[PDB]
Design a protein around this motif. Structure first.
Motif, PDB file in Angstrom:
ATOM      1  N   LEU A   1     -13.115   4.944  -0.804  1.00 26.84           N
ATOM      2  CA  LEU A   1     -12.064   4.084  -0.306  1.00 26.84           C
ATOM      3  C   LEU A   1     -11.785   2.916  -1.251  1.00 26.84           C
ATOM      4  O   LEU A   1     -10.643   2.502  -1.429  1.00 26.84           O
ATOM      5  CB  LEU A   1     -12.429   3.562   1.079  1.00 26.84           C
ATOM      6  CG  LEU A   1     -11.450   2.576   1.746  1.00 26.84           C
ATOM      7  CD1 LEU A   1     -10.041   3.110   1.897  1.00 26.84           C
ATOM      8  CD2 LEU A   1     -11.975   2.107   3.088  1.00 26.84           C
TER       9      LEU A   1
ATOM     10  N   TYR B   1       0.854  -1.180   0.000  1.00 28.15           N
ATOM     11  CA  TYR B   1       0.000   0.000   0.000  1.00 28.15           C
ATOM     12  C   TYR B   1       0.899   1.242   0.000  1.00 28.15           C
ATOM     13  O   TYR B   1       1.561   1.544   0.990  1.00 28.15           O
ATOM     14  CB  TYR B   1      -0.921  -0.059   1.207  1.00 28.15           C
ATOM     15  CG  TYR B   1      -2.086   0.898   1.228  1.00 28.15           C
ATOM     16  CD1 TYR B   1      -2.459   1.630   0.117  1.00 28.15           C
ATOM     17  CD2 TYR B   1      -2.783   1.107   2.402  1.00 28.15           C
ATOM     18  CE1 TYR B   1      -3.521   2.530   0.180  1.00 28.15           C
ATOM     19  CE2 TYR B   1      -3.820   1.976   2.472  1.00 28.15           C
ATOM     20  CZ  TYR B   1      -4.191   2.689   1.367  1.00 28.15           C
ATOM     21  OH  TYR B   1      -5.244   3.554   1.486  1.00 28.15           O
TER      22      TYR B   1
ATOM     23  N   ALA C   1      -9.049  11.481   3.328  1.00 33.58           N
ATOM     24  CA  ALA C   1      -8.664  11.848   4.685  1.00 33.58           C
ATOM     25  C   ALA C   1      -9.270  13.192   5.054  1.00 33.58           C
ATOM     26  O   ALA C   1      -9.747  13.355   6.161  1.00 33.58           O
ATOM     27  CB  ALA C   1      -7.138  11.890   4.830  1.00 33.58           C
TER      28      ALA C   1
ATOM     29  N   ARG D   1      -6.735  -7.188   0.018  1.00 34.45           N
ATOM     30  CA  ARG D   1      -7.543  -6.203  -0.691  1.00 34.45           C
ATOM     31  C   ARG D   1      -7.323  -6.326  -2.207  1.00 34.45           C
ATOM     32  O   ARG D   1      -8.255  -6.199  -2.994  1.00 34.45           O
ATOM     33  CB  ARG D   1      -7.201  -4.787  -0.218  1.00 34.45           C
ATOM     34  CG  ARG D   1      -7.707  -4.482   1.173  1.00 34.45           C
ATOM     35  CD  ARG D   1      -7.669  -3.011   1.475  1.00 34.45           C
ATOM     36  NE  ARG D   1      -6.330  -2.629   1.882  1.00 34.45           N
ATOM     37  CZ  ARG D   1      -5.925  -2.538   3.145  1.00 34.45           C
ATOM     38  NH1 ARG D   1      -6.771  -2.750   4.153  1.00 34.45           N
ATOM     39  NH2 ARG D   1      -4.670  -2.213   3.386  1.00 34.45           N
TER      40      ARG D   1
ATOM     41  N   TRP E   1     -16.412  -5.882   2.118  1.00 37.82           N
ATOM     42  CA  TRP E   1     -15.388  -5.838   3.152  1.00 37.82           C
ATOM     43  C   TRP E   1     -15.260  -4.466   3.789  1.00 37.82           C
ATOM     44  O   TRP E   1     -15.201  -4.373   5.014  1.00 37.82           O
ATOM     45  CB  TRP E   1     -14.053  -6.283   2.562  1.00 37.82           C
ATOM     46  CG  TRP E   1     -12.897  -6.164   3.479  1.00 37.82           C
ATOM     47  CD1 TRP E   1     -12.310  -7.165   4.206  1.00 37.82           C
ATOM     48  CD2 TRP E   1     -12.130  -4.974   3.737  1.00 37.82           C
ATOM     49  NE1 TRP E   1     -11.243  -6.659   4.924  1.00 37.82           N
ATOM     50  CE2 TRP E   1     -11.113  -5.320   4.650  1.00 37.82           C
ATOM     51  CE3 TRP E   1     -12.215  -3.641   3.287  1.00 37.82           C
ATOM     52  CZ2 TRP E   1     -10.180  -4.374   5.123  1.00 37.82           C
ATOM     53  CZ3 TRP E   1     -11.285  -2.700   3.762  1.00 37.82           C
ATOM     54  CH2 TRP E   1     -10.286  -3.074   4.664  1.00 37.82           C
TER      55      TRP E   1
ATOM     56  N   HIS F   1      -8.187   1.930  -3.150  1.00 33.99           N
ATOM     57  CA  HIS F   1      -7.529   0.633  -3.186  1.00 33.99           C
ATOM     58  C   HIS F   1      -7.483   0.009  -4.552  1.00 33.99           C
ATOM     59  O   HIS F   1      -6.512  -0.666  -4.891  1.00 33.99           O
ATOM     60  CB  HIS F   1      -8.221  -0.328  -2.242  1.00 33.99           C
ATOM     61  CG  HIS F   1      -8.052   0.057  -0.815  1.00 33.99           C
ATOM     62  ND1 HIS F   1      -6.821   0.063  -0.201  1.00 33.99           N
ATOM     63  CD2 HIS F   1      -8.937   0.513   0.096  1.00 33.99           C
ATOM     64  CE1 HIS F   1      -6.964   0.475   1.044  1.00 33.99           C
ATOM     65  NE2 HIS F   1      -8.235   0.760   1.251  1.00 33.99           N
TER      66      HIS F   1
ATOM     67  N   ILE G   1     -13.168  13.112   5.513  1.00 31.03           N
ATOM     68  CA  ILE G   1     -13.468  12.484   6.783  1.00 31.03           C
ATOM     69  C   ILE G   1     -13.313  13.453   7.960  1.00 31.03           C
ATOM     70  O   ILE G   1     -14.227  13.588   8.781  1.00 31.03           O
ATOM     71  CB  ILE G   1     -12.592  11.261   6.970  1.00 31.03           C
ATOM     72  CG1 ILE G   1     -13.187  10.109   6.140  1.00 31.03           C
ATOM     73  CG2 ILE G   1     -12.495  10.925   8.434  1.00 31.03           C
ATOM     74  CD1 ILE G   1     -12.380   8.850   6.127  1.00 31.03           C
TER      75      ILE G   1
ATOM     76  N   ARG H   1     -15.837  -3.163   7.735  1.00 30.79           N
ATOM     77  CA  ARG H   1     -14.853  -2.451   8.554  1.00 30.79           C
ATOM     78  C   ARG H   1     -15.353  -1.099   9.046  1.00 30.79           C
ATOM     79  O   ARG H   1     -15.302  -0.816  10.234  1.00 30.79           O
ATOM     80  CB  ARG H   1     -13.546  -2.252   7.789  1.00 30.79           C
ATOM     81  CG  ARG H   1     -12.517  -3.370   7.983  1.00 30.79           C
ATOM     82  CD  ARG H   1     -11.190  -2.841   8.548  1.00 30.79           C
ATOM     83  NE  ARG H   1     -10.039  -3.622   8.079  1.00 30.79           N
ATOM     84  CZ  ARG H   1      -8.754  -3.332   8.332  1.00 30.79           C
ATOM     85  NH1 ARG H   1      -8.413  -2.274   9.080  1.00 30.79           N
ATOM     86  NH2 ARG H   1      -7.796  -4.115   7.838  1.00 30.79           N
ATOM     87  N   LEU H   2     -15.887  -0.289   8.145  1.00 31.86           N
ATOM     88  CA  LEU H   2     -16.271   1.071   8.513  1.00 31.86           C
ATOM     89  C   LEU H   2     -17.496   1.133   9.427  1.00 31.86           C
ATOM     90  O   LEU H   2     -17.513   1.903  10.398  1.00 31.86           O
ATOM     91  CB  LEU H   2     -16.504   1.926   7.255  1.00 31.86           C
ATOM     92  CG  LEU H   2     -15.236   2.527   6.637  1.00 31.86           C
ATOM     93  CD1 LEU H   2     -14.120   1.515   6.598  1.00 31.86           C
ATOM     94  CD2 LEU H   2     -15.515   3.060   5.243  1.00 31.86           C
TER      95      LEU H   2
ATOM     96  N   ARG I   1      -6.385   9.210  -1.674  1.00 29.86           N
ATOM     97  CA  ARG I   1      -6.387   8.856  -0.279  1.00 29.86           C
ATOM     98  C   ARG I   1      -6.326  10.113   0.562  1.00 29.86           C
ATOM     99  O   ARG I   1      -6.955  10.198   1.611  1.00 29.86           O
ATOM    100  CB  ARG I   1      -5.219   7.947   0.056  1.00 29.86           C
ATOM    101  CG  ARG I   1      -5.371   7.276   1.391  1.00 29.86           C
ATOM    102  CD  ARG I   1      -4.105   6.576   1.760  1.00 29.86           C
ATOM    103  NE  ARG I   1      -4.257   5.772   2.969  1.00 29.86           N
ATOM    104  CZ  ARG I   1      -3.318   5.688   3.903  1.00 29.86           C
ATOM    105  NH1 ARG I   1      -2.184   6.364   3.752  1.00 29.86           N
ATOM    106  NH2 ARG I   1      -3.501   4.942   4.975  1.00 29.86           N
TER     107      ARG I   1
ATOM    108  N   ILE J   1      -6.189   7.550  11.096  1.00 32.70           N
ATOM    109  CA  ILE J   1      -7.583   7.307  10.720  1.00 32.70           C
ATOM    110  C   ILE J   1      -7.835   5.826  10.482  1.00 32.70           C
ATOM    111  O   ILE J   1      -8.792   5.256  10.990  1.00 32.70           O
ATOM    112  CB  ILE J   1      -7.959   8.081   9.444  1.00 32.70           C
ATOM    113  CG1 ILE J   1      -7.999   9.590   9.709  1.00 32.70           C
ATOM    114  CG2 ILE J   1      -9.311   7.673   8.935  1.00 32.70           C
ATOM    115  CD1 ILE J   1      -8.682  10.360   8.585  1.00 32.70           C
TER     116      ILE J   1
HETATM  117  C1  LIG Z   1      -7.226   0.122   4.345  1.00 31.01           C
HETATM  118  C2  LIG Z   1      -7.034   1.431   5.081  1.00 31.01           C
HETATM  119  C3  LIG Z   1      -6.570   2.546   4.103  1.00 31.01           C
HETATM  120  O1  LIG Z   1      -6.570   2.351   2.856  1.00 31.01           O
HETATM  121  O2  LIG Z   1      -6.162   3.684   4.508  1.00 31.01           O
HETATM  122  C4  LIG Z   1      -8.284   1.793   5.912  1.00 31.01           C
HETATM  123  C5  LIG Z   1      -8.929   0.896   6.775  1.00 31.01           C
HETATM  124  C6  LIG Z   1     -10.046   1.311   7.504  1.00 31.01           C
HETATM  125  C7  LIG Z   1     -10.522   2.621   7.386  1.00 31.01           C
HETATM  126  C8  LIG Z   1      -9.880   3.512   6.522  1.00 31.01           C
HETATM  127  C9  LIG Z   1     -10.292   4.979   6.289  1.00 31.01           C
HETATM  128  O3  LIG Z   1     -11.360   5.407   6.577  1.00 31.01           O
HETATM  129  C10 LIG Z   1      -9.288   5.971   5.686  1.00 31.01           C
HETATM  130  C11 LIG Z   1      -9.679   6.827   4.661  1.00 31.01           C
HETATM  131  C12 LIG Z   1      -8.774   7.747   4.129  1.00 31.01           C
HETATM  132  C13 LIG Z   1      -7.477   7.817   4.623  1.00 31.01           C
HETATM  133  C14 LIG Z   1      -7.093   6.962   5.649  1.00 31.01           C
HETATM  134  C15 LIG Z   1      -7.990   6.049   6.181  1.00 31.01           C
HETATM  135  C16 LIG Z   1      -8.774   3.083   5.811  1.00 31.01           C
END
Ligand SMILES: C[C@@H](C(=O)O)c1cccc(C(=O)c2ccccc2)c1
Ligand SMILES: C[C@@H](C(=O)O)c1cccc(C(=O)c2ccccc2)c1
Ligand SMILES: [Ca+2]
Ligand SMILES: [Ca+2]
Ligand SMILES: [Ca+2]
Ligand SMILES: [Ca+2]
Lengths: 580, 576
Positions: A234, A146, A257, A195, A210, A238, A260, A214-215, A253, A286
């Motif tokens: 998200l 990643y 962030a 993933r 998946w 990925h 959020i 998680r969320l 990404r 996060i």
């Molecule tokens: C796989 C991993 C990721 O790919 O970062 C992950 C797991 C669970 C929650 C989140 C998430 O909400 C996030 C979103 C944006 C930036 C950082 C985290 C991310």
């Protein structure tokens, strides 16, 4: 109009160069660091050109087009990588899928043994290149790592060397830190690979499911539609990483962030602490955040998903939306479950609806659906209740040894080096998991197996030799642990013919480090069971013992080699007596 | 014609030219990466080509040192890596080059190289030459005085072992024996060239000249003294050039000598024809190690021409070095059995004796021949005691005996030198003591001068013991006796106790066998530094108790952890 200008602007030169470097190291794993650097700058220089002039010639090409044009200029490509140079004959997006397919998940590169002194000078010698060399070494070894997360780790690495290189005994300061960190990195690889595997082998929707799990756990408070938005974003992040679109993955990404942090209220209260860090640190934070409190009084799931009369009408109207909803509700109020089980639970709920909504009085069939599930929750706890609580008596190393016999019997056709690497990792769950609160073992272990078992499928799927394994890996993603646990040894299996070379040992065995030695030692246990599929359980406790007593004598006695020479044929001929 | 770099490029042809140039860089810049040096060989190689096309092009008249050094001075990472070495660029030739030479590391503390036959066989067939160059580089960077042309030859043998052995099934079993034996030939060879270099640097040209008169007069006893004088000067020039970094010229001049020799086998030796019919590097190698020709039938006694004669001091005073060489010539051709070290020692006294011809000279210098052969018989006892010493203890035990003896002699010497030296001495036991007793004395005399040199050369840099410096600097020929004469000196105040030295870790178990000894011999050294007056019987109790440590532990962390401190206090009780 220029994807490369946009990415240089959005991420700034430093990150841009690291990601781009990670990209080469992941495609071209056997190429040298100084080369890849040579390839990073011109692409950086070129990128600078099109941000200056965006209509300049070629800055409107895709990043795959531009990046791939570089790979196809590599002088040693067919020579070093062979059939991969065939990829250069293709058009995008085919050229890139071809390249991707040649990514070595088992690059069998040299283990890095760190000498704190020789490393710390380089660190002070050149910081930034130290950081770069780090990005390179890990990426070539994990071609699906990643990316933005790797940048985060490179940063953390320097600070460990930055703050532990002004010491007297550096080595005592370092090794513990770098050992802890590389454990985190190993895990991080394994997750991202899973993933990646879901997408490639089970499609996007498998990974979405998946993410929902998680969320919805972490943010049980957020509305389903809120959670959906995070999911698509998200997933795209990925999907992008897993396809080599690292600049776009990183950029997106970051964008995620922000969104959020900008919306903590509708999402979580445990966010206030992450959303106040610098970007890489923020995102890691996060991703690892603590789950928010479950909302107060909520209708049982039975209400909307079993007792209700309009489920089939609702389900048929929008199946995926409806199923996602089930996954949302079930997960938000059950953090205790492993996301793996939740998926297993939703997969079940889907199959019954498919069944029952087709029958004459569908509500008659499905009303009872929560009776089948509530069992799927119970199946796993027992498989945690015989083993880590088996595990205490054997300890870890012993436990791994217990596993090799069990899995080798399950699937003897599998390559030995694979069984070893895997079997080891399954045992490591106990030290990893079973120390935890007895309550949270299940998410931990079910969550780790899904990682380890994936590693197994990914190693096997390339050089495929065992049909049971192909079955379990390919059939389903959620049910891999069940498919594998359910495995039994086949009397069909014809034992491997004896080869002395396997059971022959040399003075090198003593001059080994402690762990690799185990593997060299564990490899042999593997070979026996391949050789003697129907062997018994206690002589092994004796056969290993003559062995552990064997190596000690030779490692003890003066002429370090001679004992091996005369002792060695003796154990085989003794243990070959005990073969029956 | 007026371009030295044209001249050498034509004379040697590009391939030798490129390897030799790489050897040079690898020997000047020992810590630089192989591909960097490669880039530098080509740039200089293309430039070299330009001057053969046009010999009047710009810069083609500069000396090789000008040209090679200008390249050393373009290295961006030079001062960062080498420090004061970057000062060297501020100088003019020949000072710039003498400066660069001064920074050559005789102990570059580089990683011991373990060859993995798979990984190597992969590299080899992949690319022959870069594999070949990479050998030249790793050896040269580790021995910055390695005899260059000889190094090319070894590269050839290396590749030939790989043409073979790699087209095999069990490659490792075919390879490892071969590369291991050669690794010995190369190590020896290095020690020799290091000696020839040190003789010149520290004792002048004639010192190197005396050896050669001896070495050659043994090999070619048939040749007339004038022919030998001709060979000697030629060959001395060869080594002066190599030892000074003038490699292309060394190689070029050596070849020319090899040729000349073949063209005159008649006037030189009968054992040449088997050499003089090989390819150039091999030829030169072969000539060097050729078998000594047979001594001619019946020749005059030595007492006759150098004592009984009436003009011995007067002819001598007329031409001292020439007459002295004649002595070296004549004595040497008829003693193939003697060690060159011994012959020089003998020549050195005869010179010391000649200095008595100063009222009735004929009377004093008539008894000189009984004094000499005393010097030949003198050594023999210390060979029986050492070979019988060694025979009993075995090598490893013997080295340990030596470590103790020398650590007693010269405590101030750095721990790693003492260890490195004693070991190589102990291998003399295995190297020589096996030979027929008649020929034990010369062989042992011959390796010591190599090993003892290695001590002086390591010490000469960070000089800490007045004792070795005296012996290293005093004479070249008498180094062996000098060291034998010293006894542990009550001047030495024992090294303060340091636990860091005597603590042990699980690594000790996981070490290859060779380092294993080194870590223990290291521990043994430090003890005698701490307790100079320990006894010849307690130590074996300490060692018996000590080997009776690793066996229990070799926890894995906890026992060493508690066992070790226990053993430390045990050895610390019984230490007296
Ligand atoms: C796989 C991993 C990721 O790919 O970062 C992950 C797991 C669970 C929650 C989140 C998430 O909400 C996030 C979103 C944006 C930036 C950082 C985290 C991310
Ligand atoms: C030092 C070594 C050497 O420098 O090779 C050596 C020893 C003994 C004789 C000769 C020799 O006569 C020779 C001359 C020309 C080429 C090759 C050897 C050379
Ligand atoms: Ca592989
Ligand atoms: Ca896009
Ligand atoms: Ca040194
Ligand atoms: Ca010259």
């Amino acid at each position: 109009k220029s994807e490369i200008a946009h990415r240089f602007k959005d991420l700034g030169e430093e990150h841009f160069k690291g990601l781009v470097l990670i990209a080469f190291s992941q495609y071209l794993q056997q190429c040298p660091f100084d080369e890849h650097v040579k390839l990073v700058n011109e692409l950086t220089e070129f990128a600078k050109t099109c941000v200056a002039d965006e209509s300049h010639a070629g800055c409107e090409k895709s990043l795959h087009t531009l990046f791939g044009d570089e790979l196809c200029k590599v002088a040693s490509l067919r020579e070093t990588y062979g059939d991969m140079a065939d990829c250069c004959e293709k058009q995008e997006p085919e050229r890139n899928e071809c390249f991707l397919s040649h990514k070595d998940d088992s690059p069998d590169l040299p283990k890095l043994k760190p000498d704190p002194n020789t490393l710390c000078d380089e660190f002070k010698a050149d910081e930034k290149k130290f950081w770069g060399k780090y990005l390179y070494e890990i990426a070539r070894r994990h071609p699906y790592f990643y990316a933005p997360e790797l940048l985060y780790y490179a940063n953390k690495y320097n600070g460990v060397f930055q703050e532990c290189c002004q010491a007297e005994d550096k080595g005592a300061c370092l090794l513990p830190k770098i050992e802890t960190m590389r454990e985190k990195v190993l895990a991080s690889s394994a997750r991202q690979r899973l993933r990646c595997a879901s997408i490639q082998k089970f499609g996007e929707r498998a990974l979405k499911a998946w993410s929902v799990a998680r969320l919805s756990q972490k943010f049980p408070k957020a509305e389903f539609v809120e959670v959906t938005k995070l999911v698509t974003d998200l997933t795209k992040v990925h999907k992008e990483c897993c396809h080599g679109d690292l600049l776009e993955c990183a950029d997106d990404r970051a964008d995620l962030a922000k969104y959020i942090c900008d919306n903590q209220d509708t999402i979580s209260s445990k966010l206030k602490e992450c959303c106040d860090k610098p970007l890489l640190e923020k995102s890691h934070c996060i991703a690892e955040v603590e789950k928010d409190a479950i909302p107060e009084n909520l209708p049982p799931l039975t209400a909307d998903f079993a007792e209700d009369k309009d489920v089939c009408k609702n389900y048929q109207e929008a199946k995926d939306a409806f199923l996602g909803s089930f996954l949302y509700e079930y997960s938000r109020r059950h953090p205790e479950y492993a996301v793996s089980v939740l998926l297993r639970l939703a997969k079940e709920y889907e199959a019954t609806l498919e069944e029952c909504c087709a029958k004459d009085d569908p509500h008659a069939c499905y009303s009872t659906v929560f009776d089948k599930l509530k069992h799927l929750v119970d199946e796993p706890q027992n498989l945690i209740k015989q083993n880590c609580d088996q595990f205490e008596k054997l300890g870890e190393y012993g436990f791994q040894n217990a596993l090799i016999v069990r899995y080798t019997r399950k699937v003897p056709q599998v390559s030995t080096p694979t069984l070893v690497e895997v079997s080891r990792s399954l045992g490591k769950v106990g030290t990893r998991c079973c120390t935890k609160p007895e309550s949270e073992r299940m998410p931990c272990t079910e969550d780790y197996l899904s990682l380890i078992l994936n590693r197994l499928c990914v190693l096997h799927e390339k050089t495929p030799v065992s049909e049971k394994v192909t079955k379990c890996c390919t059939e389903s993603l959620v049910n891999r642990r069940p498919c594998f646990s359910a495995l039994t040894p086949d009397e069909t299996y014809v034992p491997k013919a004896f080869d002395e070379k396997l059971f022959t040992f040399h003075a090198d065995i003593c001059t080994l480090p402690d762990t690799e030695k185990q593997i060299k030692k564990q490899t042999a246990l593997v070979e026996l069971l391949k050789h003697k599929p129907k062997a018994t359980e206690e002589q092994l406790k004796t056969v290993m013992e003559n062995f552990v007593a064997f190596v000690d004598k030779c490692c003890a006695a003066d002429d370090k080699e001679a004992c091996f020479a005369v002792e060695g044929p003796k154990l085989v001929v003794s243990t070959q007596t005990a073969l029956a």
